[PDB]
Symmetry: C5
Subunit: 315 residues, 5 copies
């Protein structure tokens, strides 16, 4: 039941010989052990096509201050909240986001009688991702980032643990999210790794991108069965060809810009456009002076590519 006056007197006289610039140890030749417990709360996913996933994480850093220990016999307080600029706290940062991460300290530290210190932090940053889009829509992403100390190497401060959990609502929207994190020993200090794996789901909206690949397909075989007596055919074919190539342009603006392998949808569209153009050329050449063969080739190639797509299919 500590009253205001004694908490005031304590706060006046509990950092007497304390310098927040010095790691709180009785022997400074050894590292200070900091534990981390991380929770991935949300993902943005806006620029995931360009290779950047904007995620938010919550950290609970825990360490031991060996200079701010007291006992209730003299100060009947079991714990306190102390601002971040009054005592030593470690500065953490993640690779490739130093300049685009505001890092405003707003959560005070919580310090116990025996020196245990807990600090709350939240990071909102881009984690770069590598895209495997051979099967599209069902692209797969792998992401990685490393947390490190802003000022301390392995001989000055070390991550004693690194655990990650999830809010259970990461994978609720069009992603299978699987994470793993553990502490590594980097060249310039102790690092905490964080690896994410995102696998797109089978949403109807994502599969709508297949319909164009259907349309042209129909239109393609639909050049064959037309008024061959009329020259309209060649013109019609040309028209289709144009549309197809234009669509490919628009298509390239959606595909993950840089995949480990070329997506099969693009190859199918290229094949269809090439076949339509050659069909127009062939019909006009015949008019100057194959059907079943063209249909057989189309069927063979399309079935091979669809079989590959089924092979790479996920559920």
């Amino acid at each position: 039941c500590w009253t205001y006056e004694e908490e005031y007197y304590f706060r006046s006289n509990f950092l007497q010989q304390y310098n927040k610039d010095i790691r709180p140890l009785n022997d400074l030749s050894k590292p200070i052990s900091v534990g981390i417990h991380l929770e991935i709360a949300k993902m943005n996913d806006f620029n995931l096509a360009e290779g950047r996933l904007k995620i938010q994480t919550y950290l609970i850093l825990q360490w031991y201050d060996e200079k701010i220990f007291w006992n209730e016999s003299t100060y009947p307080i079991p714990k306190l909240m102390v601002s971040s600029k009054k005592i030593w706290s470690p500065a953490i940062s993640v690779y490739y986001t130093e300049n685009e991460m505001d890092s405003k300290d707003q959560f005070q530290m919580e310090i116990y009688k025996n020196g245990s210190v807990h600090q709350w932090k939240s990071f909102y940053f881009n984690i770069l991702c590598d895209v495997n889009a051979r099967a599209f829509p069902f692209d797969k992403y792998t992401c990685e980032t490393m947390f490190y100390f802003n000022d301390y190497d392995i001989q000055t401060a070390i991550f004693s643990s690194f655990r990650c959990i999830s809010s259970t609502d990461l994978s609720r929207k069009a992603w299978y999210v699987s994470f793993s994190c553990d502490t590594k020993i980097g060249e310039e200090g102790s690092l905490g790794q964080l690896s994410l794996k995102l696998v797109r789901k089978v949403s109807l909206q994502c599969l709508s991108v297949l319909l164009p690949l259907f349309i042209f397909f129909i239109l393609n075989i639909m050049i064959g069965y037309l008024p061959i007596e009329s020259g309209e055919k060649v013109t019609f074919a040309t028209t289709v060809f144009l549309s197809n190539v234009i669509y490919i342009d628009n298509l390239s603006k959606q595909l993950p810009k840089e995949s480990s392998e070329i997506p099969l949808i693009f190859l199918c569209h290229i094949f269809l456009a090439f076949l339509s153009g050659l069909s127009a050329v062939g019909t006009i050449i015949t008019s100057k002076i194959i059907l079943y063969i063209m249909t057989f080739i189309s069927i063979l190639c399309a079935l091979v590519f669809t079989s590959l797509f089924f092979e790479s299919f996920l559920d």
Copy 2:
């Protein structure tokens, strides 16, 4: 009728033994009760398609400072405005917007003779929303967020109330907005839950989504009654099929992404496309030469989808 000199003296000598880092209580073993009165002022709606609603709220925090009580006998001032960095105030935040909420303190606190303190705050944040598009064009959105203390748990500071009102303009902008908020007890402290539910008002701007379905329904059913003597029947069937599939492609781009269940319009149109394609395939197979039974069943399937669509109709 306090003059400038006596208010100057009071301001000089009214925080003598006061530390703003300490909750203003005479017994600190119990939580400080903070009451909140909230008003949802505006909505953005821009990114509601992605699943984020950007709202602005005005908060009136009210608590009791037990160390700044005075009486008019010695200080003829009934109330004062004192800056946010002179006396203790609680820092509030909302889930999932810690790192994208500027939180600039610009309104001073108002303190009465007996310690009653009122503070004004304004938050402008993204409240994540979940979309149900079963009845699209009309969609339903549910949004939720929680307010919490940056620094205090249930044993150090508690929300004694949580009330919300509106500006009477949220309803006007093409949305039925209904909200409900109350104080909860979370795992890590007292929380203020705020829940929003947005339905979409009826607009004549949804003939854009009704007309195509009606016209395509009529065209599709009219394929049965044609100059069946003419082979053009299969031509009409194919052209209608392509038109339907192109419409599917266009439509799928204006449905919400994270839809809980597939919208009914999509099912109606995709089934109509299936029907027309089956009709064309049957016509061509007959020309070159179970189908009828399936078509008969299909019409019933469309009747089922249309009944579900009308059952979910709003006003």
Copy 3:
């Protein structure tokens, strides 16, 4: 002809018993009168379709400091420039933009011998607008916001005047701008109201939005006078309908998010698409088993709508 040393001596000893947190009045029970002179400098109009106009205004606040009066007999200075953080100034803000307006105090206050103080401020904020699109593309907007004190109510500080002017270059670019501003008495203090009225010009570039409609009108009535012999008519028409319904979606994207009345362009496009669909159905049923009648109906409806548009026409 005051020298550096006497201005130095003055600046050292002219805020002796002054607290910038107190209103500079000899009797603090009465309000402090602050006069405002505003000027709308520029408009953005980028997001005006979404219902937000971004304007920049210049303010000249003028009040009387009843505690910093001096006379040239002792200090040969007629006036001074004193930084904003040395003497009391009122904090002003506007509705619905508290969280997205960066308060950078960069202009010093100008204080005369008799206490008159002038301060320069510049605000850059969104002002929400209500749209009327009954006549489109010649849409009309009404916008409105209020200025208020951050920290003072009617019994503490009051706007003694509120006057606005314009830079004369507001209406030079595709808008007729009319403004009006006066001081009101709000529930929570004195308010300064600012009302804008924007009316779009007749820019011939804007008129191209009517060009697509004309394309269809032609194609539409260009369905009857064709090689009807070729049942394909049905097909051409179905193409037309598809095109119209793919346009209408983009147009709905273009239209103002919400209008007090439904724009006529949308209704006309809906009618044209409907007529095209019925034309297809009619040719189909006729082939299973009007031209001049269809033309008369189209002419009547179009003339009625254009007559309503001309009735609503302004300038």
Copy 4:
């Protein structure tokens, strides 16, 4: 060869009776003369269609501090670098960008033995521009802005000079950039006027726009020299009409907004559309059963517009 110790001693005792809030003059009734030397380094051009050109400029302000003069007899230092918050420097700003210019001071001031002070500044601001698109694609723009003291009027501080230069790599791509600079005298003190004139280059990619102008020209002339025996002439004329109007729309989507006058190419294509439609309706009348007059009118108008276009043609 001044050592560390004597520079330390100098820095300690060279602002003894110096207030940075007072203009450094021995007679403060007269203005302080500040000289400016500006260099336009880069332009952004991204929003130049909307009328905003984002430019970066480097300023070297020069003035004379009459209170920080010393001689090497007592302080063997010829010049020093002193931070911006130790001595008086003038605050400069530009019109219509006060709220969207960071204005971070990062370059120290260079002060010589006799008081001459040089300061570096870099502005990155939008400068509103007026577009003249009569000649398209060779559109031309004019921009202007003014620099002014944040805190001083003509009787307290004046610009003694205002010179400008370019970066020598400014007009090297797609623009003929010209500049002018002079010291005006407004109602709120001395002003520094900066005027820019941008003229688009003759990049052959832009000349691609002229290809359609000839195509649709060829097509209109071509309508007459065809198998007029076939009534299809109506169909072909309607086709060129529809294509021309569709183009007109697409091009209008490219023309700059708020243009001073309607571009010539727009009128050319409008008249070509009119000619095509007139020919189509004339052929329809012929089928129902002025030609040479229409051809003469069209040739005259098109040749007049082309002569004009080529008259303004640059290079």
Copy 5:
């Protein structure tokens, strides 16, 4: 094995006669030598079409503080981490990004017993690039930036070295990146010149602009060898030519904005069009009153352009 108390005592008494505004030299008439070691970590190339590449670099500045030398005999500390606002550090900046680079000092400095000081910095800035489009899609970019001291010239501070390395993952993604950096001597002090060269990799996705040309080429050369007896030849030529105009319009939207040369592919296409259209004209006009000649010229010039492209062809 230094304990907390002696490090506290050291930090209290190791900046006794130190001014962080003074370069840490014993003879200040000579420059202070600062070494740099740079690493381009990532690049964004989102706006690379506009000519701006956004790269992130990591710097390790190294210099010698001649005033903070101590020895272990009195202070058993071999090195220390000291904040950036306790001792002198140089301010570095790069050309043309002063106003769009946050520059937050977050990494402390590491100082050794003998005065060697290291500092960590990270810059995230745009580096302007020049585009060569002669080989399309295999465009080549050249970029350059210059690092300099915010406050020091060649007689006050100098870059003793300037070395750059790479993270080895720059070129992993659709770019050949080759850097080079060395120190220069500019007119405003020592400079660090950084040069980049980007050359797009030869993918298959970047070979979908080959097919549209090739096919078109054939089509264009297939206008001559046709059933010339059939007058429809001219109609097919108009169809292909309209396709050509549409494809030219599409392609003009993909080229880099400001290329030094004229993209060869764009040339090929536009020239093929103009000459084929002239051939069709020639045919119709002559009938109103060459084929092989136009085919020969088209082949000659198209092959000349293709060879000109193959010349610079990369892999």
